Design goal:
The PDB classes it as oxidoreductase. Keywords: oxidoreductase, superoxide acceptor. Two copies of one chain form a homodimer. By secondary structure, chain A is mainly β. Chain A is built from one helix and ten strands. The interface of A and B includes residues 47, 50, 111, 149 and 151 of A. The complex binds copper (II) ion (CU) (2 copies) and zinc ion (ZN) (2 copies). One zinc ion binds near residues 61, 78 and 80 of chain B.
């Protein structure tokens, strides 16, 4: 596909729409998320597009290269590690990311997988406990959605 | 992808979980839908995995081969025409379909697209009218979901 979309929903007030578009050899991620607490929130692609148990059945971070968690700019990162989105005073976060690891086709395709917005900030694999190395201490999954092909 | 899952949701009471498994050159579709009126309901793969406007933004039946609407056993059918599912007196439909056109990979892949359960029976292209050859006269979209990768 050259375009994908994801509608995020959860059990609280957090909702949003994220669009993905292949522009050249990279993927541009845009959109906005509302209902969040002010500050940074971990924003990642989880492996399974399985919503049978809410966001929980999405599994861990998409990680075909079997690396540890990190920031979007690190070499050692999961493919699904997109960093943090930042909510303003009003709970609105605007998404504007360009990423070199995800794709809309092939082995790194994220179509069919789940976008998750987390409760806390992602520490980028630098928190110093085992958990940092897995999820960045980003905490619970506030909203998520399966990434589908768009028009 | 060898397994997929879809969780169907809408604005009324219809809900369900559909599972997909690649077996030889076919896809085996299983699962259950509840909250349906007794009888037949059309069950099709729609083109886009776009839920921004409910089931409406899913677009038309998935039809990469530009054919007219038919039943699953017809040569002239859309790739997304899986026929009808049947709800019992209690409103429960058990899904058990084996289909050779839909796929979980390649060009006819349905991952990232939308599974839709309709209000009325699909006439399989034999309704005599023009709508019959587009949608089977299945009526409105009761519940739908994006097809994601499962474990
Ligand atoms: Cu995460
Ligand atoms: Cu349909
Ligand atoms: Zn990660
Ligand atoms: Zn059709």
């Amino acid at each position: 596909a050259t375009k994908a979309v994801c509608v995020l929903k959860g059990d609280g007030p957090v909702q949003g729409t994220i669009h993905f578009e292949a522009k050249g050899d990279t993927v541009v991620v845009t959109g906005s998320i509302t209902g969040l607490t002010e500050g940074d929130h971990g924003f990642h692609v989880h492996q399974f597009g399985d919503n049978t148990q809410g966001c929980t059945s999405a599994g861990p971070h998409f990680n075909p290269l079997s690396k540890k968690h990190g920031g979007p700019k690190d070499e050692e990162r999961h493919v699904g590690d997109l960093g943090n989105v930042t909510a303003d005073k009003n709970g609105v976060a605007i998404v504007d990311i360009v990423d070199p690891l995800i794709s809309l086709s092939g082995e790194y395709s994220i179509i069919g997988r789940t976008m998750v917005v987390h409760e806390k900030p992602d520490d980028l694999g630098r928190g110093g406990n085992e958990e940092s190395t897995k999820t960045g201490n980003a905490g619970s999954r506030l909203a998520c959605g399966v990434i589908g092909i768009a028009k």
